[model samples]
Every structure is written in C-alpha cells, then in structure tokens.
Target: MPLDPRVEQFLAQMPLSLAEARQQFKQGALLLDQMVPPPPVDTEDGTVVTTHGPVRIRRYIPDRLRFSHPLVFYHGGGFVFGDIDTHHGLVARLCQTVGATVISVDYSLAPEAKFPVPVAECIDVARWAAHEAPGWGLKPSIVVAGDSAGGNLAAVVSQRAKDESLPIAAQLLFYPALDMVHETPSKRDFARGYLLEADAMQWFGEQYLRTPDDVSHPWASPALSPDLTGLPPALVITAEYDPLRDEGEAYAEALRAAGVPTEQIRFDGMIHGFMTMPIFPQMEAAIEAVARFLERID
Candidate 1:
C-alpha cells in the first residue's frame, strides 16, 4: 500500500524523535492548520486550583450551551507535551462546526506529574466543568472528548462520571490510545512512521506510568475498565495507518458490547494524529460527521 499523498508529505517531513515532534507540532502547526478558517468564537483562559494543583483550561464559546451542546476536550501528546494552546485552534473550529461551546483542558503532563496525576487533573477539571457549565452561562448536554493520551483521559473521565452519576451527553475518542499495552498488529505495522510511532508511544507510556504495573490500571488504561456499560454514547475515530488503530476500534466494540451506544470510523489512507490537520479532506469529513452525530444524538 503506497502512502496517501498528503500523508506521504507528512512522512517525509515529520521528526522521528518524540521531543522534536512535539516541539514542531506545538510551534509550527499553525501554518498547516490555519488553512481551515476558524469560526467566530469567544475564548477565555482560566485556571482552577485543585488539590493536585492549578489546572489551566481554555474555553471557546461559539454558542451558549443552553442553545447548543458543549464539548470538553483534552489534547493528546501521549500525556507528555500538549497543552491548551497546542490544541486551541483545533478545538475552536470544533466549537464552530459543532455549534457548541468547546472547553480545551490543559491538564498536567507526565514524567513530572506521572500517570494518575494527569488522569486526576482531567477528572477534576471535568467535574469542575460539569458543575460550572450550568452556572457559567451554559446549560445541559455536556460531552467529554480527546485524542490519543487525551482520549485515554476522556474515557477514564467518562467512566468516573458514570460512577458518580454525572449527566454526560457523549464521548469522542480520536484515534485514542485506549490500551497502553499496544501490542496490536497495527502497532507493529505502523510502528516506524505514520505520524505516531510505536517507540514514541512506548516512551510516552513510560513517562506517564510510574510503575510497570499501571498498564492494567483501569483509569490509566480505560480499555481495562470493567464497567464501561454505564458510560455515555461514544464516537471512536481510528486511523487505518495509526498504531493506536486497533485499541480505538476495540474500545468501540467494547462500548457496544457493554450496551453503550457506540460508533466507530476508521479513516482509510489516514495517518494517526492527522484528525486536526487540514491537509486532507478526510479531516473535515471527520469533523462534519462528529457535528451531525452530536446534533442528532443530543
């Protein structure tokens, strides 16, 4: 299989090292991303100090939640390098396209924070958002969403919400790394290139999880969560060439088997982590699909 032409350009230029990739993506992505015109939206950058620490979050209000659904999104850097600014442009567009307010979380990252800390920060921010939305000039129909490690946090947050009986509207996992024991053929198949490599994932996982035993921890790896039945309806997006492809697909099936309504879409010829990029039409197609799904479901 020859690479998709857009992804071929991506493959030719992207750094193979994890640090270089994050730095480039964080600093240099706007040129490629700015191609998609962002919808008019209002943004607020605020910090919430919890027991863990101050978690920074940026909220984009494209519409009042009373009139539209809101998406609370986390960024994916394998739990290491992403922050609010790293994902701002992407989430801003989602807010406009989905016709909803979008909150992008800047949760603590790893090596410094480690596995459960980032998870805890995400959960705490989610809890705050759930409570604050109703009073912060927003309303019902809240969703939890993220990509990669961020997606892992989203799933775990959804599980935690279900346990506490929070009123969540939906779940969106974008080529998420649901299972850290990513031994799937897709991992080996796309291990070297395709944007998100196996060794990078392994390095990220090591940086996030303090102990090897954390791999099976339900919150650390949401696919390991035993009671996914009560979690909200979900949309799991996977890339055909992504190392995380299998785990994301497996999670959709797992959610369906658990009786949670689930939808899975594997983007043929798409590379992992390209959902936010504007280089391919499939990227916009994915966003449009999500908008329609959220509108129909909520």
Candidate 2:
C-alpha cells in the first residue's frame, strides 16, 4: 500500500533539513522552556522519587479504573530530548483509554547524561514504580511503554526487570529504535521524506553512544541482546514509512522466536510518531488497540 495522503501532506510541509531540524528542535525546546506545555500548577500527581538523583514523574489516574496495573512510560526523543510535558497529553490519553494509571518518567537525556545514563535511569524508574505501586494505587505488575528511543528504553528496562525477577505484565513499543546498527532495509527504504530520517537517527545515536562498544550493549541496543528468553510479552507498533520500522518488526520476531508471546502491528500509510498527532485520523484506533492489549493482560 502507498503512503497515507495525510502523511504525504505532512512530509511535504516539512521544510527543515537535518541541520535545520536540529536547530528548530533546539529553538522549540527553548521556546517551550525545556518542557512542552510548561509545568503544571500542581505537581502532586506522582511523587518525585530519587532515581539516579531527582527525576520528576507525572502520573495520570483514570476516572473509572478497571485494572490496578500501571503503565510506566518513557517519552522518545532519541534519548536526547523529551520531558513529561512533551508526553503529557499522550500519557493522559493512555491512562484514560486503558483504564490504568500511566506514569511518565522524565529520564536524563544524552551528550550530557550519555549512553548508559538514560537506560539506567529508566530501569531504576521501573524498579521504583514496581516497588511503590501500592502508594500509586497500582498493582505490582506493570506494562512498560515508550515510543522511538523511549521504546528502546522500555524494552531494555523490561529485559532488566526479567533478569532481576521483577513482575512486568507486558511491553508496549511504538516505532522503537531497537537496533543501533543502521543496516536494516527499512533504513535504506525510508531514509528520507519521513519525519525521522536516517541521518537524523544517526545523529541521535552518535550523540547518545559515543563509542562502538556501546552499540553492542544490550541496554543500548535491545535487538543485540543475546538472550530474550525471560522477557515479558509485547505489543510492538510500527509505522510503514518509518526508518525504524524494520528493526522494530525484527525485534518482535526475535521475541516471538524466543518463545515470548508478541504481536506486531504495522500501521499502513503512517509515518513515525503518528500516535502523537492529534489530527491523525487513526490515532484513536491505535489507542484502542493498546487499550485492548492492556485490558487483556489485566
């Protein structure tokens, strides 16, 4: 199938080059004051537990809760950007749709925090969430969730949880950047014209992981994990025209081969980050699918 006309229109309206995109993102970050939608008046949603030193988290509690399980989410920005504000609306929607609390962590970004920093923060957050579930009105079991780089964080955190014998209900990965090696077919096929370009991804990876050794680290590249045996079941979502599509699908396949129950959904005619677009017609459908998955596990 061809790219969705709406996505095509979006691509056509994209007037920034890789350098321009980075500059614009920086300016946007500044204009938004290091957070999107700025900070809220009340910060009592989720307690700021010191994980690798104070990281603020926002929790969304559903009005009519059907399940006690919570979803710990990490926002995606190539592990270089993104905060609670950037993902606030999405997290709120997920909490409402899934009928479960959504905890969004603002992990440290790269170049300053570097490769292992973000991953470590994510894992710590997951452990903290699981341990402090009762206080948050959640069960011990949790569904780790993220999009793009955050998806990678979610996968890595889930793997770490399994290794540590923690209880994780499932994983929700959206257009995840699972593999550091950009040799996948999708990288070549959808290198440009999409919201995320190959060079842009390379830039993000380069900034996050400064050394070749980091590429082989399972925390840095979940697809490079030698054993995926004990990981939790997953719902992997991919966009057809995204450069990370192939790697996300490949990760799903790897999980399935390792005897993990996994379902991969490729959203046809969509580009990367379609789930965040409020105007996207299929956004509700995507949310519904995720809600159904969370409900099943609960």
Candidate 3:
C-alpha cells in the first residue's frame, strides 16, 4: 500500500523543525480536542506515589465493559511532549473500543528527567495498577500499552514484569521506537515527510538519552534486549510510512521467535501518530485490531 493521502496532506503542512513541530503538536492536540467527539467514558484524575515520586494518572472507565483488565497507557510524543490532555480522545476511544478501563500515565518527560526515569515510572505504574485495579472496579491484571516513546516504556515494563511478577496480561504497542541504536530500511525510506522524520527521532534521542550508551540499554531500546523469553503476548501495530515501522515489526518477530505469542499489523496507508487522530479512517481498523488482540488476553 502507498502512503495515506490524508497523512501526506498532513505532513505537507507540518513545520520542518522540532521547535515548530513541538508547538504544532500542542496545537494539534487542541485541534483534536475540538474535532473529535468524546466517547462515553467516565473520567477522573488521580496520582500514584512511585519510586520516582508522585506521578499523575487519568482513568477512563467505559460505560460498556468488554474486558475486565485495565489498560495502563503511556502516550507517545517521543518521551518529550505528550500529556493526558493531549491523548484524552484517543484513550477514551480505546476504552470504548477495547471495552476496558484505561489509565493514562503522565510520566515525566526528557531533558529534565532523562532515560530510566520514564521507564522506571511506567514500570512503577504497572506494578501500582496491578495492585490497585480492583479499587477502580476492574480486574487485578493489566495490559501495559503505549505508542512510540510510550511504547518503548511499555515494552520495558512488560520485560520487567516477568522478572518482578507483576500481573501484566499483555502488551499493545503502536509504531514503537524499539531500537535507537540502529536505523532500519523504513527509517531510511520514510526518513522525511512521514510525520516521524528520522532527524526528529535523533533529536528526541538527544533530549531523552543521557549519553550515547543509553541507546544500547535494553530499557531504552527493548528491541536490543537479548532475552525476550517469557514476556507477555504482544500486539504490535505499525504504519507502512513510519520511520519506526521495521523496528516495531522486528520486535514482534523477536517476541514470536522467543516463543511469545505475538501479532503484528501494518496499517498500509497510515502514518505514525495516526492512533490519536480519530479523523483518519485507518484509526477504526487500528482500534479493531486492538480489540481482537485483547480477546485473547483472558
């Protein structure tokens, strides 16, 4: 499949630099808030005391329940500039489509917080959610979920859950930036004008990583992790035009190779960050894929 024409139109109007993109990304959130109608989910704001300190979380409980396990979600934006408000509509839609409670994590961002901070915070939230889900009137288990940078954090949390015995039922990753140490074909092919520019990824790395060595750390790049054995089952979603496409698919392959049940779907005409943009027709297919994956979680 070729690039999504609408996504191409979106990219055509995008600012070239990270500074301008950052502002536009913020404005994009405001635009989405106005454009997409909110789903029928009750929401509340709360905080959890983690090892990293207090981390805020937003809970979205669906009016119609499908899955009892809650989704502990981490929003994308390269670990730099995404919050609960920016992802409000997306999370609510996930809650509606997947029929599960969604908890949106407000992890600390880069530069000020650095690598391992967001990773640790997400893992802590997974542990906290596993222990705390029943209080939210959900199951004791949870699905660690995220997109892009947040997907990196969720992948790390899933790995650690095995070692720590946290109740992580599954992992749902959307166009995750799994490997920072190496560039894949998609990175070179869709290096520009694909919403996730290769240069922008490098800039995000510079801000999030403490040093070059951090790129090789398994927590930072879960695809680089040698042992994927015993991890939870995964559903990896990729965009045909995304720079991070290959790494996310490869991570799914690695998980399957390691004897973990994994499913990978490439939204052929989509772009990175399409999960949050409800306006795209591909978003429905993406959410449907998620629902099918969650069916096996139980």
Candidate 4:
C-alpha cells in the first residue's frame, strides 16, 4: 500500500534533511510543548515505584472499570525522546474507549540514561503495577503497550516478565522497532518519505547504543530474542509506509509461530506515529481495533 496522502503532505513539508531531523525533532518537541494541550488532570494520577527510579505515571480511569485489567503504556521516541505529555491525549482516549485504566509511564530516556536502563525501568514498572495493583485500583493483570521505541521497550518488558515469571496479560505494540540488526523490505522501500527515514533510524540507533554488541541484545532488539514461546498474547500494529513496519509484522509472526496468540494489523495507508495523531481520521480505526482487543480480554 502507498503512504497516506496526509502523511505524505506532512513529509513534504519537512524543512530538515535526514541529518537535521534530530535537531528539528527537538525544536518540534519544544513547539509541541506550547501547542499541544496539557495532559488531562481530571483523572486520579500519581507516580509509581520503579527499579531504575521513581517514574511519574498518569492514570486515566474510565467511568466504569468494565475489566479488572489496566494498560501500562510506554511512549515512543526511539527511547531517546518523548514523555507523558507527548501521548497524553491518546492515552486518555484509549482508557475511555477501552474502559481500562491507562497508566502512562514516564520511563527514563537515553544519553542521560543509557542502554538497558529504559528497558529495566519499564520492567520494574510493569512488575510493580502487577504486584501493587490493589493500591492503584487496578486488577492483578495488566497489558503492556507502547509505540515505536516504547513499543520496543514493551516487547522487551514482556519477554523479561515471561523470563521472570511475572503476570502480564498481553502486549500491544504499535509500529515497534523490533530488530536493530535486521532491516526488512519496508526499511528499504519506505525509507525516505514516511517521516522516519532509514538514515535517521541509523542515527537514532547509533545515539542509543554505545557499542555494536548492544545491537544483538534482546533488550535492544526484541526481534532478536531466540525464544518467543510462552510470552503473553500480542496485538502488533504496523504502519504501511514506516521503516519499522516489516520488523513489527515479523515479530508478530514469530510470536504466533512460538505458540503465542497474536493478531497483526497493518494500517495500509498510515505511517509511523500516526496512532498518536488523533486529528488523523485513520487514528479512530486504530483506537477502535485496540478497544476491541482489550474488550475481548475482558
């Protein structure tokens, strides 16, 4: 499928080259700080216990908690950027639509915090959320979710939980970067025009990983994990024109092959991070699919 016309327009307006996208992203983030509405404070929210350190978590509770399950969400940015505020609106709407408490974790990012740090923080948050469910008005089981880099973290967290014997109900991965070592056809085909260039992805990986050794590590690339058996059921969302699309779909296929129940949805006309843009009409379908998935588990 071709890129969505809206996403193409968004990419067409890019004033920065691949080398300058990082700086532009930072500048964009700053502007986003001013334009994007502040995260909702109406819901009961608070910080939570974490292994790396204390993580600020925002809770979006629905009018009725239909299911005893909650979603522990991690935001995207290649683990280099993004915070609770970036996906605040989407998280709130997800909670409302799914009728499940949404706990958005402000996990530590890179440079300040290096490789494995973000993954460890996510694992700690997931474990704590499951163990301390009652205190947070959540049930024992929780779904782990994230987009892009956050989706990578979520996959790592799920694998870690499986290894550690923790209770995780499911995993929701949105256009996740699953393998650093492997580049698929999507990476080559849509590398330049989907807002996330292949060169830019290489730059992000270089910035995040201090050593080449880090590239093959399961925590750094969940798709490299040797064993996917017994991991939680997964809902893997892939964008048509995103570099990460093929790897995300491959991971879903791997999970299914390993006997894990998995559903793979490819948004044919979307691009990376489209789920975060509620203004995009296709985002409604993405949210609806997620709602249906969560509702089934309930």
> Tens digits of per-residue lDDT for model 4 on 1-298?
6667877776777774543644665566555435444344347667776667888888777766765777899999877667787777678767877777888988877666888888888888887778877776667887999999999989998998867667899999999998999878988888886777887688778768878889998889889888899898899999887888899999999999999989899998888988776546677688889888876764
Tell me the lDDT of model 2 at 69.
79
In order, what lDDT does every prediction score? 0.79, 0.79, 0.87, 0.81
Model number with the top lDDT: 3
Which residue ranges in model 3 land beyond 4 Å of their true spot?
15-23
TM-score-better candidate, 3 vs 4: 3
TM-score of candidate 3 relative to the true fold = 0.95
Ranking by lDDT: 3, 4, 2, 1
lDDT of 1 by residue, 85-152 (tens): 76765687787777677778888777778878877787777777777876666655579899888888
Per-candidate TM equals: 0.91, 0.89, 0.95, 0.90
Ranked by lDDT, the better of candidates 1 and 3 is 3
lDDT (Cα, tens digit) per residue for candidate 2, span 1-298: 8988877876787654645644666564454334233222223455455546767788777767776777899998887767786666567678777777778998877767788887777777777778878887678988899989899999988889866666898999989988885589888998988878877787887889979778878888889888999689899999998889999999999999999889889999999887766456666678888988776774
**lDDT assessment of candidate 1:** 0.79
Relative to the true structure, candidate 1 reaches a TM of: 0.91
Error of 3 at 287 (Å): 0.9
Better of 1 and 2 by TM-score: 1
Q: What is the lDDT of residue 134 in candidate 2?
A: 81
Consecutive 10-residue window with the lowest summed lDDT within model 4: 32-41
